[PDB]
Design a protein around this ligand. Structure first.
Ligand SMILES: CCOC(=O)Cn1cc(-c2ncnc(N)c2C#N)cn1
Length: 295
């Protein structure tokens, strides 16, 4: 018999994920079906999104050879029935206060920083780059979390040194770029560009660096369709473009420049979005989502 979620102490909530204490050395890392668009958590959940993203993360943890925080299988008996398939048993780490971002392509705040200054996180880039330009080598573009309201703040390597130590900063940079490169090549071979990605790391009792949080989900990474990659214009979000298009289209009745909370999504947009997540997962993993565990 699996424990109830109510048997565990809630210790943290994010926009779409939750964290629970299991015991002194383990946590329960829970994905919900919530989806964020335009910095709003939307009213409408995407069915099975939590399970699909958990499956994705587990696949990539298995693909990478680096130590990670997984502490049991996806069907570990410590996982409650209610969150089966969308929750992982993980080792408690001392988390390092750095958002470890790799960018293989120039978009979002990386592009904006470049357009304003010619540089991103201390990297002075070639002239003539633009939206969705390929970066080679990939850039380490670290960030720090800001207040409840603001977006993460881009920082340079010196800031990372000041946060975690000189040798540790080098390690974060090198590991971030190495594992991004591996995952990006894998995905591209399957027809998906991972344009960028965000990692969090922690340290275990021995001082070892351990990859944590979630890895290479479409929430932590920009997924693009490689078959439609066209430098110079904004690439469609593989998973979220239907949501984006509807919210900013003629049917929603919502003005994005209002910063008022957006309206609920049509059921068929939510179902279509679920299908995009499943397609991304199956293409990348070579596995069938119908085989992924659930309640
Ligand atoms: C609610 C969603 O936000 C987070 O979970 C971010 N976060 C992660 C930790 C963490 N803390 C100790 N050990 C870990 N293995 C982890 C992980 N993953 C804390 N906040």
């Amino acid at each position: 018999m699996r424990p109830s979620l109510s048997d565990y102490q809630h210790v943290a909530s994010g926009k779409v994920r939750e964290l629970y204490r299991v015991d002194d050395e383990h946590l329960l890392f829970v994905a919900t079906d919530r989806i964020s668009a335009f910095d709003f958590v939307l009213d409408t959940p995407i069915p099975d999104k939590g399970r699909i993203l958990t499956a994705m993360s587990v696949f990539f943890f298995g693909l990478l050879t680096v130590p990670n925080h997984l502490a049991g299988p996806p069907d570990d008996p410590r996982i409650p029935e209610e969150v089966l398939g969308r929750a992982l048993l993980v080792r408690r780490l001392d988390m390092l206060p750095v958002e470890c971002v790799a960018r293989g392509y120039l978009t979002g705040s990386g592009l904006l920083d470049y357009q304003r200054t010619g540089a991103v996180c201390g990297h002075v880039l070639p002239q003539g780059l633009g939206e969705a330009s390929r970066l080679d080598p990939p850039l380490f573009t670290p960030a720090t979390k800001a207040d409840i309201g603001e977006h993460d703040m881009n920082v340079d390597f010196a800031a990372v040194v000041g946060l975690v130590g000189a040798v540790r900063a080098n390690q974060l940079r090198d590991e971030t770029i190495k594992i991004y490169t591996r995952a990006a090549a894998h995905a591209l071979h399957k027809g998906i560009i991972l344009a960028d990605t965000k990692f969090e790391f922690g340290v275990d009792i021995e001082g070892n660096l351990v990859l944590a949080d979630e890895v290479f989900t479409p929430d932590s990474s920009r997924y693009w369709d490689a078959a439609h990659y066209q430098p110079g214009v904004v690439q469609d979000s593989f998973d979220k473009q239907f949501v984006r298009n509807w919210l900013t289209g003629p049917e929603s009745g919502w003005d994005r420049a209002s910063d008022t909370p957006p309206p609920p999504l049509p059921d068929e947009v939510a179902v279509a979005t679920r299908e995009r997540y499943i397609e991304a997962y199956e293409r990348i993993s070579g596995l069938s989502f119908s085989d992924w565990i659930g309640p």
